Coordinates of all heavy atoms in Angstrom, one line a residue:
Chain Q
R20 N -32.4 39.3 67.2 CA -31.6 40.3 66.5 C -30.2 40.3 66.8 O -29.8 40.0 68.0 CB -32.2 41.8 66.7 CG -33.3 42.2 65.9 CD -33.1 42.1 64.4 NE -31.7 42.1 64.0 CZ -31.0 43.2 63.8 NH1 -31.5 44.4 64.0 NH2 -29.7 43.2 63.5
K21 N -29.3 40.5 65.9 CA -27.9 40.7 66.1 C -27.3 41.7 65.2 O -27.7 41.7 64.0 CB -27.1 39.3 66.1 CG -27.4 38.3 67.1 CD -27.0 38.6 68.5 CE -25.6 39.3 68.5 NZ -24.5 38.7 67.7
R22 N -26.2 42.4 65.6 CA -25.6 43.4 64.7 C -24.1 43.0 64.8 O -23.5 42.8 65.8 CB -25.8 44.8 65.2 CG -25.8 45.9 64.1 CD -25.7 47.2 64.5 NE -24.4 47.7 64.6 CZ -23.7 47.9 65.8 NH1 -24.4 47.8 66.9 NH2 -22.5 48.4 65.7
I23 N -23.4 43.0 63.6 CA -22.1 42.7 63.5 C -21.3 43.9 62.8 O -21.8 44.3 61.7 CB -21.9 41.4 62.7 CG1 -22.6 40.2 63.4 CG2 -20.4 41.1 62.5 CD1 -22.0 40.0 64.8
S24 N -20.3 44.3 63.4 CA -19.5 45.4 62.8 C -18.0 45.3 63.3 O -17.8 44.7 64.4 CB -20.1 46.8 63.1 OG -19.2 47.8 62.7
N25 N -17.1 45.9 62.5 CA -15.8 46.0 62.9 C -15.2 44.5 63.1 O -14.9 44.1 64.2 CB -15.5 46.8 64.1 CG -14.1 46.9 64.8 OD1 -13.2 46.1 64.2 ND2 -13.9 47.6 65.8
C26 N -15.2 43.8 62.0 CA -14.7 42.4 62.1 C -14.2 42.0 60.8 O -14.3 42.7 59.8 CB -15.8 41.4 62.7 SG -17.0 40.9 61.5
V27 N -13.8 40.7 60.6 CA -13.6 40.0 59.3 C -14.5 38.9 59.3 O -14.6 38.0 60.2 CB -12.1 39.6 59.2 CG1 -11.6 38.8 60.4 CG2 -11.9 38.9 57.9
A28 N -15.2 38.7 58.2 CA -16.3 37.7 58.1 C -15.8 36.6 57.2 O -15.4 36.8 56.0 CB -17.6 38.3 57.5
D29 N -15.8 35.4 57.7 CA -15.4 34.2 57.0 C -16.6 33.4 56.7 O -17.2 32.9 57.6 CB -14.3 33.4 57.7 CG -13.8 32.2 57.0 OD1 -14.1 32.0 55.8 OD2 -13.0 31.4 57.6
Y30 N -17.0 33.4 55.5 CA -18.3 32.8 55.0 C -18.0 31.5 54.4 O -18.8 31.1 53.6 CB -19.0 33.8 54.1 CG -19.8 34.9 54.8 CD1 -19.7 36.2 54.5 CD2 -20.8 34.5 55.7 CE1 -20.4 37.1 55.1 CE2 -21.6 35.5 56.3 CZ -21.4 36.8 56.0 OH -22.2 37.7 56.7
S31 N -16.9 30.9 54.7 CA -16.6 29.6 54.1 C -16.9 28.5 55.1 O -17.4 27.4 54.8 CB -15.1 29.5 53.7 OG -14.9 28.3 53.0
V32 N -16.7 28.9 56.4 CA -17.0 28.0 57.5 C -18.5 28.0 57.8 O -18.9 27.8 58.9 CB -16.2 28.4 58.7 CG1 -14.8 27.8 58.7 CG2 -16.1 29.8 58.9
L33 N -19.2 28.3 56.8 CA -20.7 28.3 57.0 C -21.1 27.1 56.0 O -22.1 27.3 55.3 CB -21.3 29.6 56.5 CG -21.4 30.6 57.6 CD1 -21.9 30.0 58.9 CD2 -20.1 31.4 57.8
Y34 N -20.4 26.0 56.1 CA -20.6 24.9 55.2 C -21.0 23.6 55.8 O -21.9 22.8 55.3 CB -19.4 24.6 54.3 CG -18.3 23.8 55.1 CD1 -17.8 22.6 54.7 CD2 -17.7 24.3 56.2 CE1 -16.8 22.0 55.3 CE2 -16.7 23.7 57.0 CZ -16.3 22.5 56.5 OH -15.3 21.8 57.2
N35 N -20.5 23.4 57.0 CA -20.8 22.0 57.7 C -21.9 22.2 58.7 O -21.8 21.5 59.7 CB -19.5 21.5 58.3 CG -18.8 20.4 57.3 OD1 -19.3 20.2 56.2 ND2 -17.7 19.9 57.8
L36 N -22.8 23.0 58.4 CA -24.0 23.0 59.3 C -24.7 21.7 59.3 O -25.2 21.3 60.3 CB -24.9 24.2 58.9 CG -24.2 25.5 58.9 CD1 -25.0 26.5 58.1 CD2 -24.0 26.0 60.3
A37 N -24.6 21.0 58.1 CA -25.2 19.7 58.0 C -25.1 19.2 56.5 O -24.6 19.9 55.7 CB -26.6 19.8 58.4
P38 N -25.6 18.0 56.2 CA -25.7 17.5 54.9 C -27.0 18.1 54.5 O -28.0 18.1 55.2 CB -25.8 16.0 55.0 CG -26.6 16.0 56.2 CD -26.1 17.0 57.1
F39 N -27.1 18.8 53.3 CA -28.3 19.3 52.8 C -28.9 20.5 53.7 O -29.4 20.2 54.8 CB -29.4 18.3 52.6 CG -29.0 16.9 52.3 CD1 -29.3 15.9 53.2 CD2 -28.2 16.7 51.2 CE1 -28.9 14.6 52.9 CE2 -27.8 15.4 50.9 CZ -28.1 14.4 51.8
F40 N -28.9 21.6 53.1 CA -29.5 22.8 53.6 C -29.7 23.8 52.4 O -29.1 23.6 51.3 CB -28.7 23.5 54.7 CG -27.4 24.0 54.2 CD1 -27.2 25.3 53.7 CD2 -26.2 23.2 54.3 CE1 -25.9 25.7 53.3 CE2 -25.0 23.6 53.8 CZ -24.8 24.9 53.3
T41 N -30.6 24.8 52.7 CA -31.0 25.7 51.6 C -30.1 27.0 51.8 O -30.0 27.5 52.9 CB -32.4 26.1 51.7 OG1 -32.7 26.7 52.9 CG2 -33.3 24.8 51.5
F42 N -29.5 27.4 50.7 CA -28.6 28.6 50.7 C -29.0 29.5 49.5 O -28.5 29.3 48.4 CB -27.2 28.2 50.7 CG -26.2 29.4 50.7 CD1 -26.0 30.1 51.9 CD2 -25.6 29.8 49.6 CE1 -25.2 31.2 51.9 CE2 -24.7 31.0 49.6 CZ -24.5 31.6 50.9
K43 N -29.9 30.5 49.7 CA -30.4 31.4 48.7 C -30.0 32.8 49.1 O -30.4 33.2 50.3 CB -31.9 31.2 48.4 CG -32.2 30.0 47.5 CD -33.7 29.9 47.2 CE -34.5 30.0 48.5 NZ -34.1 29.0 49.5
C44 N -29.4 33.6 48.2 CA -29.2 35.0 48.4 C -29.6 35.8 47.3 O -29.5 35.4 46.1 CB -27.7 35.1 48.7 SG -27.2 36.8 49.4
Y45 N -30.2 37.0 47.6 CA -30.7 37.9 46.6 C -30.0 39.2 46.6 O -29.8 39.8 47.7 CB -32.2 38.2 46.8 CG -33.0 36.9 47.1 CD1 -33.9 36.8 48.2 CD2 -33.1 35.9 46.2 CE1 -34.6 35.7 48.5 CE2 -33.8 34.8 46.5 CZ -34.6 34.7 47.6 OH -35.3 33.5 47.9
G46 N -29.5 39.7 45.5 CA -28.8 40.9 45.3 C -27.3 40.8 44.9 O -26.9 41.6 44.1

Side-chain angles (χ1 to χ4, degrees):
Chain Q
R20 274 310 330 281
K21 294 292 320 312
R22 214 191 91 251
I23 301 299
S24 171
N25 170 357
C26 82
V27 56
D29 185 4
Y30 274 126
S31 187
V32 276
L33 272 320
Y34 75 122
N35 261 1
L36 300 164
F39 332 119
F40 63 92
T41 61
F42 182 76
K43 282 181 308 306
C44 196
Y45 313 125

